[PDB]
């Protein structure tokens, strides 16, 4: 039937789309991580959390490519699957850590960032690693079909739940950091609130709450296409809006370029 060839075309289109997106969000975020790491002045707790987010985007890109290798061409397949099911969860938890960090700065201004910095790196990396290890042990001891690809509700939900929790808590933090911006624009501006919302939705990954509780069996293409295309370009969006469009980073680039011009 033509259903077969159109489905083949479909999956090919989606696979080319996320290959282009996780190529672009790999190259532009290696550039962004290089600029942030090299520039001495831009070291700060905010830009350290930024750098951890950006290298999480890099590891997500690299884990999708490594997973794609086992799709193109067990002992290997399972390790690729674990690294793929680890980078994603560490990305979502670093979006949660950025939400917690901006709501910590706002709600409790009079605080030392250094005291919680090791409590933020822990939330960012250790808890995905804990869940990942629980999932790996759970697939080993309980039941194994072959390479870990088929979704089984008991086994799947152990790495599903914390993602839903992170998306929910970061949406609630997003509602609080669109309450505080309204309570601070009010004594002085719809345009400014709207610009802050459209510059704070890619940072906190608000768009995931559209399809968060959405069930996968219900709509085949609506979730997959939107989510993979948006997610794929999300790294490029955050890179452009935050590394290349910050005033201070453009200032530093102009300064370095004029110092190279004089020399």
């Amino acid at each position: 039937a033509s259903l077969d060839e159109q489905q083949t075309m479909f999956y090919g289109s989606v696979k080319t789309g996320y290959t282009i997106g996780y190529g672009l969000s790999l190259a532009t975020l290696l550039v962004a991580t290089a600029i942030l790491s090299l520039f001495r002045k831009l070291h700060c707790t905010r830009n350290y959390i930024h750098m951890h987010l950006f290298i999480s985007f890099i590891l997500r890109a690299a884990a999708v490519f490594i997973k794609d290798l086992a799709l193109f061409d067990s002992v290997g397949c399972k390790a690729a699957m674990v690294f793929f099911q680890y980078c994603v969860m560490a990305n979502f938890f670093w979006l949660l850590v950025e939400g917690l960090y901006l709501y910590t700065l706002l709600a409790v201004s009079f605080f030392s960032e250094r005291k919680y910095f090791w409590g933020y790196i822990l939330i960012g990396w250790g808890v995905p690693s804990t869940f990942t290890m629980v999932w790996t042990i759970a697939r080993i001891h309980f039941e194994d079909y072959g390479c870990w690809d088929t979704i089984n509700s008991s086994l799947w939900w152990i790495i599903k739940g914390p993602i839903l929790t992170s998306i929910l808590v970061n949406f609630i933090l997003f509602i609080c950091i669109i309450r505080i911006l309204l309570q601070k624009l009010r004594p002085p501006p719809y345009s400014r609130l709207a610009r802050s919302t459209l510059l704070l939705i890619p940072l906190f990954g608000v768009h995931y709450i559209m399809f968060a509780f959405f069930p996968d069996n219900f709509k085949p293409e609506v979730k997959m296409v939107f989510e993979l295309v948006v997610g794929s370009f999300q790294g490029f969006v955050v890179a452009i809006l935050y590394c290349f469009l910050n005033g201070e980073v453009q200032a530093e680039l102009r300064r370095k370029w004029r110092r190279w011009h004089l020399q």
Binding site: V64, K67, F84, Q85, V88, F92, D149, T150, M224
Partner: peptide
């Protein structure tokens, strides 16, 4: 997340296309 379930759908599709191609080879 969408990536996992997409990967599983694509694997089941590849397995069904493999079954159909083997069935067409034999027939």
């Amino acid at each position: 997340h969408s990536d996992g379930i997409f990967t599983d759908s694509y694997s089941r599709y590849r397995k069904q296309m493999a079954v159909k191609k083997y069935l067409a080879a034999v027939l």
